[PDB]
Symmetry: C4
């Protein structure tokens, strides 16, 4: 058998794998930052890993254009020359292969972030619709804010148990919500308080509003904020440049319509057109425009 | 009888109903957030509800285009197939029908916010003039800031009387203005202090300036700010994209004029035109431009 | 005698009166806000008032276009029908006519701000050059920041001596710089400290950065900040829209040059042009472009 | 001998001198602000000064266009009439010529900042590639942030040892990180803490996010922030206007492609083209576009 790459099955499968790549982009950075020391999430994480291996089999059994190539040997060799390496490294189950704690293993499972490359390949499918690229651009913004929230928590959590003298952002969070840290590192804020504060601070940093309660005090926190001010300004020159451009592209029929209507209105004023003729001019423009766009 | 939809009466009535929809958009969210436990506002609220019912009768008696249809049966059936459902639900007097406190009834009167749909329909009338769409866009910005101020006060007021341990924004407001809360929830800021601080914080959040005195500390306050940072950035890519585009559209005659004037100026420099001819060139451009735009 | 409106004298006089209007726009709001209870400023203020009266005489003796009109009666009648009223009210010496303190008289001298209308008239002269409209736009931004700094100090100074209980921005300034207010309103910050802090806060508010040390606490201070967030966002959609557009207009020769150069570069790549011909193509474009712009 | 200005040697040498100008732009302001009272930096600083003198010799031995001029006398005279003065003053070793402390001498070595003019000349080379002008624009932004960080530290360090009464930004930094100043000016933050805080504050000021921990309190600090709010807004109207324009220029093939594809898609919808013809239309557009761009 062989799947045609343009078929309605392969279209639905590629949009299903977009949602599983978004699951990887959320829960892999989160587990590596917040959770390092069956459940519904533990079985879902296995189901998703199985579907990312099934997608390797579909890539051995899909046609390609280089009109179409359909021979299984020329398909398999094209994948082995192309993306099979990255798609395989994104699937190696290192948790079953290494023993050196669950911290090393859970950090090594960040190799799953190579699944973002499956979305970077298939942009010919995903970018075709204006409403789909608006969904992509807002998910890219919300995922950059989330990955930075995981890095910001790693910077806090790698300094809170140190000889910090109560300066870093996690001690200040403990004081600000009335959940202070004891000297042994016991007590303190919950994982919900620490995650919600980290995500709040990185949306605050990226959108460039500082409400004054979370702020960087250690040199590592300040160097992280210098980097997020560089990222946030390149990202606003790119993402929110493109988001407004796609909104203005969706609005483009109406933007042209107002422009041509005002040219007709000024022509009507300049020639001082009488009402029995004027109605025929402006009703003709409405008929012609609604007919042809 | 039957109203022509293009008549000067129906034009004035549609602009009158825009101002009554703005009254609904201000005073319905405000009453549901700040006031839940005759006066000039109580009689005005009844007068406005009566005029929104009269508008249902005008919709049973207005022509429509599908050239015009004027038969009262084809008018009435078109409205029953179309918007009559939403226009009726926006007019059901639930305060006269339900008994379960004045809190439930006052919250249920938020069904009046369906009147915003009357403005979403009639955009063919309201968007025709550049100065009118500037008035709409600044009212949309000021109303989003006000609706968010009502949600932010609901988030504060649903946590201030809880076992909060004096963390949320209303306790901090009480301390900052020297009107502290007693343990029983007595004393505290006035409704003017709480409304002005809520509206100040949501214009602060939407325009992305944090002056440092109001800030989100509870997880619900931080999740609200994460949402207002997403809303504010999509809204600036849309509203303030469009506001500058309409200002640049109003300026477009002058923007073209400077561009053509500088082309003529560079042509005059490049050919080194003598003054007796140069004056005739640049005065001709001024005459021709002021004649034709 | 009669001045030709296009003469090199009238050109120099109109640019001199722009600088005297900027003096009025700075020192009239400043004196009315900060100074209300000879010196170099007192004699300069008289010299400037004399030159704004001389400009009324020049307006009785200047030609106008309605080709030119040069008859002194048709000049004088055109000015009496036009701007003479506003130009006269901008020159009435109320300090010599009224007695009711120096506070009323100094506030009434704000009638001099009508001199801003002389700049609003003569925009045909002042907007002709791209570098001059950049100077205007940055002076409009710096003057809006200064007028708002005078309003913000009036809001502070009308509440500091009240039964405020040490909440408003001037008490907090006194504490922050170690110059606290005594209970009698004695001590406190200097006029330099109060002006520099007011101007700092309004550039902070207009550019939407809040560094956290100055913040609005009273309802009047918060309502002022709600207004400056509305002004600042309309102003950025207008002034900094136009400033970037004028910078991009000054850059337009280079922006076209890169665009045409890259079209020629892609044509050269697509046809795979040999070097002996390629040099002639790209050197011709450099010669033709530097010849014609 | 004589170097051809277009040769692959002179191309590599001009890109090497760009990296040595960036070294000067970083380490000269840093040494003059932070370090004023062999090592790897002391020998690198001598090596760089030698290479900037070798570049004067290359300028005496390079052809120029005024087709090319290659005569060594006409080359040398063109350089003596042109840039030789500034290139020589950028190389005078004042440290070997003056004795009046190492503070005066180290401040006088800021004459090396004239090397930025070598980059301002050669923009015909450096601006040719879109990825190179993105590297320039982000280095200009990061260097403006660094030069302002050196000025901000000079403003702090010229007031910290004064009769300040613990108001200025360096005393507040000492308190915020638990490294307070003793009355003699001993103790306090390290040069890493002071530099990282100064650079953090100027990226914070330029990108218009104030996180609330560093803020200007003295009049000199507030006047510096008024200036950085003026610089940052002109710079965002220029640098981040241009950075988005170059990103949109790099994207321009794809932006045209989506626009033409949607015109073809709307033509196909409007004429209701049957599938056997539709495939030939849209595959032809893909073939023609991938052939010609």
């Amino acid at each position: 058998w062989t799947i045609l790459h343009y078929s309605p099955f392969k279209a639905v499968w590629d949009w299903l794998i977009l949602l599983l790549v978004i699951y990887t982009a959320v829960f892999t950075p989160y587990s590596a930052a917040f959770l390092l020391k069956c459940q519904p999430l533990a079985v879902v994480d296995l189901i998703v890993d199985i579907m990312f291996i099934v997608d390797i089999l579909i890539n051995f059994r899909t046609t390609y254009v280089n009109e179409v190539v359909s021979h299984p040997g020329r398909i398999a060799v094209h994948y082995f020359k192309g993306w099979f390496l990255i798609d395989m490294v994104a699937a190696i189950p290192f948790d079953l292969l290494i023993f050196g704690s669950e911290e090393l293993i859970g950090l090594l499972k960040t190799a799953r972030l190579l699944r973002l490359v499956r979305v970077a390949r298939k942009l010919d499918r995903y970018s075709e619709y204006g409403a789909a690229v608006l969904f992509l651009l807002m998910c890219t913004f919300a995922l950059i804010a989330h990955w930075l929230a995981c890095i910001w928590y790693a910077i806090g959590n790698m300094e809170q148990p140190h000889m910090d003298s109560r300066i870093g952002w996690l001690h200040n969070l403990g004081d600000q919500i009335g959940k202070p840290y004891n000297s042994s590192g016991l007590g303190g804020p919950s994982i919900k308080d620490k995650y919600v504060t980290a995500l709040y601070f990185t949306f605050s940093s990226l959108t460039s509003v500082g409400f004054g309660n979370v702020s960087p005090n250690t040199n590592s926190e300040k160097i992280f904020s210098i980097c997020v001010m560089l990222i946030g300004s390149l990202m606003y020159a790119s993402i929110f440049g493109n988001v407004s451009a796609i909104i203005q592209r969706l609005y483009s029929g109406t933007a042209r319509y107002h422009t041509q209507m005002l040219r007709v209105r000024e022509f009507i004023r300049f020639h001082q057109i009488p009402n029995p003729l004027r109605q025929r001019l402006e009703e003709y423009f409405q008929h012609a425009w609604s007919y042809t766009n």
